[PDB]
Structure formats: C-alpha cells, structure tokens
With several copies, the nearest count.
Chain A
Amino acid sequence: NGNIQVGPTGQLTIQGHPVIGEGGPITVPEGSEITIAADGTISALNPGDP
C-alpha cells in the first residue's frame, strides 16, 4: 500500500505505520510539497520560498 500520508509534525506514515528509510523513520520539514523520484528520492519544497 503506497498511500503515504504526512502527519501534523511531518512524519511519513502508511496506514498509521511510520515509513522507514535508509536512516530510519522519515522526518519531513513540516508542510512541504513532497516529490518522490523513480528510485525513492524525496524532495521537499517549503511554501513561500523560491
């Protein structure tokens, strides 16, 4: 199930289970347009900034 949701504090959870990356569970910069590449690279864009 690849339906990933972003928590209020930026934790990536699938069905309430915190997703685990190469360094453990992922902490996303609170509020960000997450883009996942073809191999799993996560890019975060913060609102307002360029």
Chain B
Amino acid sequence: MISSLWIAKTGLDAQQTNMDVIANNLANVSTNGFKRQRAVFEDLLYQTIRQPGAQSSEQTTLPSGLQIGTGVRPVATERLHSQGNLSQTNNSKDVAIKGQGFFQVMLPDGTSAYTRDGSFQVDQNGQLVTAGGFQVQPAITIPANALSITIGRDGVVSVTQQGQAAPVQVGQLNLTTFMNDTGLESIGENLYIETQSSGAPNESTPGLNGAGLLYQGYVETSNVNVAEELVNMIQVQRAYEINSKAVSTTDQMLQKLTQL
C-alpha cells in the first residue's frame, strides 16, 4: 500500500531466495557429482521524477535527479561447475570424471539427459544403467559370467571371461561436452537436459577435445564448501532481520498516519 513496504517485500523475497539456495546446497553435501549454486541479484525499477541531464536555467544542466528506485529481483542462479574431490570406494562400477565431461543417459520417454554421477549398476539383462534405473548411453552390455570389469582411462570397457587370458572389449564409454555447462536444465535425479542456452551436445571420447579422464573406483563428491555456507547463513539472517526492521518502521509510520 506504500512504496517502502513493497521495496522491503522485494528485499525479503531476495534474502529468502538466498536462504533457499543455501539450504539446497547444504542438503546435497553427500550427493555425488553435485554442483553448488549461487544466486545473482539486480536492481528493480527507477522512477524518473526529475530527469538527470535536463537543462535548468537555459545554460545549466541538472546532474543526478530523483532516480527513486524500487526493490531487488534475483537475476538467475548459476551453478559452479568445478571439479569435486575424488573419493575412493574401491568398486568396479564407480566411475569418476576428472575433467569437464558428462555421461549421456536415455530417458525411457525417448529423449536423452546428461549426468555426472558415476555410480553405475547392472540390470537383470546386463546393461550398464544409472542407480535410478536409467540406461546409460551407449548401451554397454556386460556378459553373464563376468569375473572382472575394467573401465580404462580412455572410456574403453573390458570384461575378463573364464578360460580367456585376454580381456574382450564390450563397449566404449563416451563423454558429452557443451559450450555452456551452466545452461543445462537440472531435472533432479542428478540429470541435466539440454537447453538452447547450453548449445548442442558434443560427443568426445575421454582424453581428447577436452573431455576428462575416467577413473575407476572413484566417485566425484560434491564441491559444496560448508564454512562458506555458515558465513552465508549469518548474513542471510542479519540482512533478513534488517529488512524486517525496515518493514516495522514503515508500519509504525503508517500507523501514526492513520491514528493522527
């Protein structure tokens, strides 16, 4: 009902959104292949009133007129695509990416998403799938009586059979790289779908063109730095308290205006 109250509402909304970003980063600390988010804010409208630059006194201009502004709006949340710390779990099926690549996965509805989480499983038919049951591309198939699975640093997959001293290559694990990795739309389940702001999927085997190198037995942990999150808690709390103080002051002013 009054301008200062709307501006303080926008400020409260921005600080709340910062709190959601912090909480989302914290809840996914243990998530493998997670990237922390950071929100960016911009200024809202600026009422012109006295125009800065308009000529007063015929030969003297007016510098810096009344640019009364409105509150704040968050521009967007950008993910920090940096290399998370590698953790050794000693498993034949965990694959960790050390560079800037993505695994390609086919959703059963027909389209393809992209994931960085490398904890892979085997279905009843022998295909390499994600822990959510989504079949990784390409459809690397593992034989029935496998004794050991070796995923090399170039993405080649070998299976050691009984009675064969030489491993047999059963597939080739590729990495997908994009022009802009922040433009991928996160749909949950550690899955990204390609958008028009993220360019087009560039297939590359691991080691060339930039795709990273695949480590076996390692998992890429989340890059969330938690002490920074606590310091951000302290601010996101004071700033919210101060905006609420502004709301209270405007409320008192309106109350005295009403009471007279």
Contact = CB atoms under 8 A, between A and B. Distances in A.
A and B touch in the complex (CB under 8 A): yes
Say what secondary structure dominates the interface of chain B.
Answer: loop
Interface string A15-48: 0000000000000000101010111010101111
B169 interface: no
B51 A35 contact: yes
B55 A43 contact: yes
Contacts of B209: 47-48
Nearest to B60: A37
Contacts of B211: 47-48
A16 to B, nearest CB: 10
B57 A39 contact: yes
A39 B210 contact: no
Given A47-B209, A47-B210, A48-B209, A41 B51 contact: no
A35 B50 contact: yes
Given A46-B210, A47-B209, A33 B51 contact: yes
Interface string B51-76: 10011111010100000000000000
B88 interface: no
Interface residues of B, number: 13
Chain A, interface size: which category? 10 to 19
A43 B51 contact: yes
B210 A41 contact: no
B58 A35 contact: no
Interface string B98-134: 0000000000000000000000000000000000000
B210 A43 contact: no
Contact of A48 (B51, B54, B57, B210): B210
A45 B51 contact: yes
B48 interface: yes
Contacts of B54: 35, 37, 43, 45
Contact of A39 (B50, B51, B58, B62): B58
B55 to A, nearest CB: 5
A41 B58 contact: yes
A48 to B, nearest CB: 4
Interface in B131-179: none
Contacts of B210: 31, 46-49
Contact of A33 (B48, B57, B60): B48
Contacts of A46: 210
Given A47-B211, A48-B209, A37 B57 contact: yes
Contact of B56 (A41, A45, A49): A41
* 3 A-B pairs with the lowest CB-CB distances in the bound complex, closest first: A47-B210, A37-B56, A48-B210
7 contacts: A31-B210, A33-B51, A35-B54, A37-B54, A39-B57, A43-B55, A47-B211
Given A47-B209, A48-B211, 14 more contacts: A35-B50, A35-B55, A35-B62, A37-B56, A37-B57, A37-B62, A38-B56, A41-B57, A43-B55, A45-B54, A46-B210, A47-B210, A48-B210, A49-B210
